[PDB]
Amino acid sequence: QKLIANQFNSAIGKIQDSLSSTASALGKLQDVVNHNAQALNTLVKQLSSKFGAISSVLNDIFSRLDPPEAEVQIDRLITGRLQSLQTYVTQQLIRAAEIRASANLAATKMSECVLGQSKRVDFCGKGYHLMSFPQSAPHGVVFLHVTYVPAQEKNFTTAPAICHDGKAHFPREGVFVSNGTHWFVTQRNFYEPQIITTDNTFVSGNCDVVIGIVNNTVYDPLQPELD
Amino acid sequence: NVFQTRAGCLIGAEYVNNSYECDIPIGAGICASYQTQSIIAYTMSLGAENSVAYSNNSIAIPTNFTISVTTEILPVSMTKTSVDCTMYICGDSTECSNLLLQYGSFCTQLKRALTGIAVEQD
Amino acid sequence: KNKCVNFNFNGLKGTGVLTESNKKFLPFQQFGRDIADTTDAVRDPQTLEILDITPCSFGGVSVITPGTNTSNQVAVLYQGVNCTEV
């Protein structure tokens, strides 16, 4: 408990250092901001564009041309700006579909990571998921996914099952693992060697049907009791 | 210095047989980066090569572990923009505004779409 | 100044509200533009004073309705409009 709590505290503390030192850690939200700003800027820029007209300002068009002659120029400018605004609306719709997909993903991640625990691989961050925390952002959500990663692995020799009394035993959980001299049952993700007994193994069939089966003692706790 | 790539001809970079995790992608598996004093192009490195020790009787199990925290970022909303047809289209002038009526219900469609996007953000 | 008026400054026709400005034009610049070429500021041809060109107040109006089946009362929301004016 102490070591795990200290590790969690250290990681949470280093999150701020990583966020501040990184040049573009928040690049994804800044991308939406920049996309909106650029769309608006280009939409405004198109106003200065002449679209083939004698000028891009309506007052001069109405001044130095008769209404019958200026009507074509007005029609050209109006159709050009209508097309520009329709293009803006279409781009907004496409980006809104993308944002809706992202928001649905964010809601699903909230529900699964924060409101529960996710068995999905690489969904609530990379690694064996524990939990997550949401953090508010100007136009998004930042998830502080807490994950579990194995470390300090070591080699071992194993067999699928243990044969005893002419019958094969298989583990309820974990693997049959030995450093080379003694056989122990160990859980997969943290080396916890258990003594091999009937408590953590179940029998199935005779021993000749299993490839690579090995022999070792399987203590019965009732025998020492001798009730 | 001139080099040839499937994406085209590259001038000003020297090709180096070394493989690095690359910064600037050019194409066809060729990237470039600052050598340090020069610009170098090279084939991408997809990471280290690891012949994991497979065997019919060997296992590797973690004797320890680490609990780590990583930050994921996802946008959720965008700016709720509103547009006025008359002012943008022709700058709030009467002569132009009079003619704009002839084009029909475009603005109703555009404003409906923008309002739908705005409500979708909320 | 300080009210919406149609203005013509040695040309440069436009409409807006005029206010004194602190931006310092160079001795040869007649008028200024903001991002995307909005006629942000102008210099008075006669007094040589510097004046901003602020667009006249505008905004969308939205009507709050409790349902015609319920009542005919309504409230109007002037988006972007300060209550110091209309």
Partner: peptide, 22 residues
């Protein structure tokens, strides 16, 4: 802090403010 930002174009405010999101 890390992320930062008429002619007929205006931006409406979101229904949920930053304080309520927090």
């Amino acid at each position: 802090n890390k992320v930062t930002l008429f002619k007929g174009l205006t931006v409406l405010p979101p229904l949920l403010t930053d304080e309520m999101i927090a």
